[PDB]
Ligand binder design. Structure first.
Ligand SMILES: COc1ccc(C)cc1NC(=O)Nn1cnnc1
Length: 284
């Protein structure tokens, strides 16, 4: 049996290295990573790889790893795929812990926009979790945390994190992580996966996929929202992605909204993440 070396970037930024048989399907590697992480509530998560065009792709657990990575290295990241709308209802604190780590990266990367005050508040809960109670021995007037909190750090952001950290005395890591999640879940882009596209007139839009449904970000004004029940069907053909929307009651026929993606693979990628979001959050 010939085995291939796999490298996985974990949500703490560490590397996990393991072997799988070269013909292995994605589920084999995922199960090894989740066992390494002591994770039981696994199906919120997944593995990503970067394709020949440098796009993020989800590793399909039903398909051979080699038929997905194809010409690329067997290098993956462990990520949240399906962001729970109500993290309090997760059964395990370790699940919430990994979800916090993902959201911290979503924030630092700028995928999850966040006000100044909420950046500082989330940062303060992270510090309480990682370091425990505020200690003025480590923190002077000139303190800057090792923790990345934001896409752009400023001294006043660092100061606000400390001021808020002082308020959290006695809070345990699990408590701080639950407060982090109860704040982060309210952000308008929480768990929204964004895809570049053009509308039927050729205007550049972003299509957002999340638990609640589909979002069409045309500009700061005119955000179109389709809750999953309103979405009758989704399809792709060539570089085109199509959403069928149910008619109001007493309407005869569903409406079709068409989008142009950069290429055929971007259209398939969007269709699949939409189907998967429909599939796991039809149930959950
Ligand atoms: C109950 O599990 C599901 C249900 C629906 C869907 C869409 C997915 C899963 N899980 C899943 O794919 N787990 N996994 C394996 N490798 N990466 C992630």
């Amino acid at each position: 049996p010939k085995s291939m070396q796999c490298k996985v970037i974990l949500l703490d930024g560490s590397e996990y290295t393991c072997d799988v048989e070269k013909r292995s399907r994605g589920q084999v590697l995922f199960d090894k990573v989740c066992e390494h992480l002591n994770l039981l509530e696994k199906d919120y998560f997944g593995l990503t790889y970067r394709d020949a065009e440098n796009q993020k792709n989800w590793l399909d657990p039903a398909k051979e790893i080699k038929k997905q990575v194809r010409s690329g290295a067997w290098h993956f990241s462990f990520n949240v795929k399906f962001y729970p709308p109500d993290p309090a209802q997760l059964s395990e604190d370790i699940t919430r812990y990994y979800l916090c780590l993902q959201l911290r990266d979503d924030i630092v990367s700028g995928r999850l926009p966040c006000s100044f005050v909420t950046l500082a508040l989330l940062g303060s809960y992270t510090v309480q979790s990682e370091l425990g109670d505020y200690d003025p021995d480590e923190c002077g007037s000139d303190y800057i945390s090792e923790f990345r909190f934001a896409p752009n750090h400023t001294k006043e952001l660092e100061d606000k994190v400390i001021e808020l950290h002082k308020s959290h005395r006695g809070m345990t890591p699990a408590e701080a992580e639950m407060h982090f999640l109860e704040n982060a879940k309210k952000l308008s882009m929480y768990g929204v996966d964004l895809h570049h596209a053009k509308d039927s007139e050729g205007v550049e839009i972003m299509l957002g996929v999340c638990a609640s449904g589909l979002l069409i970000y045309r500009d700061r004004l005119r955000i179109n929202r389709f809750a999953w029940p309103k979405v009758l069907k989704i399809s792709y053909k060539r570089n085109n992605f199509y959403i069928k929307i149910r008619p109001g009651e007493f309407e005869q026929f569903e409406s079709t909204i068409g989008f142009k993606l950069p290429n055929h693979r971007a259209a398939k990628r969007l269709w699949k993440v939409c189907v998967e979001h429909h599939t796991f959050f039809r149930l959950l």
